[PDB]
Design a protein around this ligand. Structure first.
Ligand SMILES: *[C@@H]1O[C@H](CO)[C@@H](O)[C@H](O)[C@H]1NC(C)=O
Ligand SMILES: *[C@@H]1O[C@H](CO)[C@@H](O)[C@H](O)[C@H]1NC(C)=O
Lengths: 48, 48, 42
């Protein structure tokens, strides 16, 4: 239940670290980017 | 379909090739159509 | 979101409006051959 598009995307994986696989789905107002790579996260994931 | 053929003249070197690797140890059996590329040592004991 | 046999499936729907009492369906929109192990999400 949303207005003004606050919710953006999702992350899927096993441990969400630079070691094992990770899926990112991002929706940065232009296109639906789906990216499965070996990806690093921080403890406060946010977008401007 | 499964296709198999011979590549002796394309993957054999007199000095020996070591570019091709396999895995021998894992904790649990593999799910169908699954790929794992971990490198963690097989924990056979208690001390890491 | 579903993940079976190495395939990742995503169904979606949008509508205008606690959750409301009503009936609606969802249409398939994404299928991908990801084929990995997924346990936790964010
Ligand atoms: C941001 O949007 C552009 C639009 O072309 C896209 O190419 C890019 O992958 C997007 N980045 C993220 C992190 O979603
Ligand atoms: C997926 O990862 C979890 C995390 O440890 C593991 O317990 C599970 O066995 C893995 N899946 C398979 C099929 O091995």
């Amino acid at each position: 239940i949303e207005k003004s598009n606050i919710i953006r995307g999702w992350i899927f994986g096993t441990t969400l670290d630079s070691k094992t696989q990770s899926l990112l789905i991002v929706n940065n107002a232009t296109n639906v980017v789906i990216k499965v790579c070996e990806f690093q996260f921080c403890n406060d994931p946010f977008l401007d | 379909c499964v296709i198999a053929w011979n590549s002796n003249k394309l993957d054999s070197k007199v000095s020996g090739n070591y570019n091709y690797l396999y895995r021998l140890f894992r904790k649990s059996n593999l799910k169908p159509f699954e790929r794992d590329i971990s490198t963690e040592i097989y924990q056979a004991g208690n001390k890491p | 979101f579903k993940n079976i046999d190495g395939y990742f499936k995503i169904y979606s729907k949008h509508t205008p409006i606690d959750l409301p009492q009503g009936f609606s369906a969802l249409e398939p929109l994404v299928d991908l051959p990801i084929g990995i192990n997924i346990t936790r999400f964010q």
